[PDB]
Design an enzyme around this catalytic site. Structure first.
Site, PDB file in Angstrom:
ATOM      1  CG  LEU A 191       4.589 -21.988  20.937  1.00 51.00           C
ATOM      2  CD1 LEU A 191       2.661 -20.968  20.511  1.00 51.00           C
ATOM      3  CD2 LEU A 191       5.722 -21.427  20.900  1.00 51.00           C
ATOM      4  CB  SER A 249      -4.428 -29.319  22.693  1.00 46.57           C
ATOM      5  OG  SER A 249      -4.159 -28.670  23.560  1.00 46.57           O
ATOM      6  CG  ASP A 266      -9.874 -22.504  31.450  1.00 44.45           C
ATOM      7  OD1 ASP A 266      -9.836 -22.518  32.457  1.00 44.45           O
ATOM      8  OD2 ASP A 266      -9.513 -23.591  30.420  1.00 44.45           O
TER       9      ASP A 266
HETATM   10  N1  LIG Z   1       1.330 -16.781  20.352  1.00 42.39           N
HETATM   11  C1  LIG Z   1      -0.228 -17.087  20.303  1.00 42.39           C
HETATM   12  N2  LIG Z   1      -1.513 -17.430  18.997  1.00 42.39           N
HETATM   13  N3  LIG Z   1      -2.231 -17.677  19.628  1.00 42.39           N
HETATM   14  C2  LIG Z   1      -2.827 -18.690  20.210  1.00 42.39           C
HETATM   15  C3  LIG Z   1      -3.491 -19.436  20.720  1.00 42.39           C
HETATM   16  C4  LIG Z   1      -4.754 -19.119  20.169  1.00 42.39           C
HETATM   17  C5  LIG Z   1      -5.423 -19.793  21.107  1.00 42.39           C
HETATM   18  C6  LIG Z   1      -5.498 -21.293  21.612  1.00 42.39           C
HETATM   19  C7  LIG Z   1      -6.596 -21.997  21.545  1.00 42.39           C
HETATM   20  O1  LIG Z   1      -6.049 -22.880  21.998  1.00 42.39           O
HETATM   21  O2  LIG Z   1      -7.923 -22.011  21.777  1.00 42.39           O
HETATM   22  C8  LIG Z   1      -4.392 -21.841  21.695  1.00 42.39           C
HETATM   23  C9  LIG Z   1      -3.166 -20.637  21.635  1.00 42.39           C
HETATM   24  S1  LIG Z   1      -1.007 -18.367  20.826  1.00 42.39           S
END
Ligand SMILES: Nc1nnc(-c2ccc(C(=O)O)cc2)s1
Length: 329
Positions: free
Chosen positions: A44, A50, A155
């Site tokens: 995604l 990351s 952030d």
């Molecule tokens: N569709 C999604 N659901 N949770 C997501 C999500 C949650 C945390 C992080 C993080 O870097 O902490 C990145 C994406 S993206």
């Protein structure tokens, strides 16, 4: 003749009175889950830090998100894990469901809950006045909680706020830049996205605090009620502060500099120029008037202030009249 020190006016010593293990993340001993419980499915996001993937937990067919941490010092990984663990169960805080040593770079990989996210560039166009009040209120609960737990997110921005609109579900994610507040510590001003960066970061004032998140939030509130993303659109860090001075005016800006005795880069001299403080109504037009109100302008006014010691705290913000249709319901 150096800068005047500062201190958060609220939650100033929450970490000072908690056991050492609460903030001493470098001594944290990680307990690992099993990486074979997860099957990645689609990538995604790809950023400089990351690789994020939608994934499936094969022991229950539950969707999750896996963030594989590219190699990057054990300190940064431990900081985020320790913080995510300290905040787990917090209101609207993304839930860290598991931690595993990911063979895809032997690196660790954090497993988060999945949020059926309507992407921010399409949603904001369809929200109502009540919807923004509601979500602003939800974001505030997360920040007052994290702040009340001695942690600055650093952030806050639309990508870092997941919204599953149909379920009125909100999650504040990516705590990768988050840090523990210890009164009198000089932090790294190079945090937050350009458009959400606060004055303190832009004039290189390091002894900042939780009120950094309040500025970022104010920038989001502005973008939503005026429907202009991002609201302060600068070309770079120097131009960013110029974007802010054109709206808030240079007078107050220089009053801030004087109060904290901040030596300004001589290159900021000619480009800041001289601007009067504008009225928020000047940004009100026919495509955004239905999301604007005296309460809103007043609430926004109290968020976007140069002096970080004058911005509203998350708790004070929740008490604002802008939220009674919300707090009443
Ligand atoms: N569709 C999604 N659901 N949770 C997501 C999500 C949650 C945390 C992080 C993080 O870097 O902490 C990145 C994406 S993206």
């Amino acid at each position: 003749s150096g800068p005047v020190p500062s201190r958060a006016r609220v939650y100033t010593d929450v970490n000072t009175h908690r056991p050492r293990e609460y903030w001493d993340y470098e001594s944290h001993v990680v307990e690992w889950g099993n990486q074979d419980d997860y099957q990645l499915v689609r990538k995604l996001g790809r950023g400089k830090y990351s690789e994020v993937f939608e994934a499936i937990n094969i022991t229950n067919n539950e969707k999750v998100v896996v963030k594989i941490l590219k190699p990057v010092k054990k300190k940064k990984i431990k900081r985020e894990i320790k913080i995510l663990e300290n905040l787990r169960g917090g209101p609207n805080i993304i839930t860290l469901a598991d931690i595993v040593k990911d063979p895809v770079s032997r690196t660790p990989a954090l497993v988060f809950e999945h949020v059926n996210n309507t992407d921010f560039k399409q949603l904001y166009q369809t929200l109502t006045d009540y919807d923004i009040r509601f979500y602003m209120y939800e974001i505030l609960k997360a920040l007052d909680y994290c702040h009340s737990m001695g942690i600055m997110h650093r952030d806050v921005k639309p990508h870092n706020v997941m919204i599953d609109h149909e379920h009125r579900k909100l999650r504040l994610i990516d705590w990768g830049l988050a840090e523990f507040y210890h009164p009198g510590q000089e932090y790294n001003v190079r945090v937050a996205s350009r458009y959400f960066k606060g004055p303190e970061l832009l004039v290189d004032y390091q002894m900042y605090d939780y009120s950094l998140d309040m500025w970022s939030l104010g920038c989001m509130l502005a973008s939503m009620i005026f429907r202009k993303e991002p609201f302060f659109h600068g070309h770079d860090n120097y131009d960013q502060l110029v974007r802010i001075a054109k709206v808030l005016g240079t007078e107050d800006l220089y009053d801030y500099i004087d109060k904290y005795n901040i030596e300004l880069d001589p290159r900021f001299n000619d480009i800041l120029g001289r601007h009067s403080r504008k009225r928020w109504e000047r940004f009100v037009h026919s495509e955004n008037q239905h999301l604007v109100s005296p309460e809103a302008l007043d609430f926004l006014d109290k968020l976007l202030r140069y002096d970080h010691q004058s911005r509203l705290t998350a708790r004070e913000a929740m008490e604002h009249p802008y939220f009674y249709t919300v707090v009443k319901d």
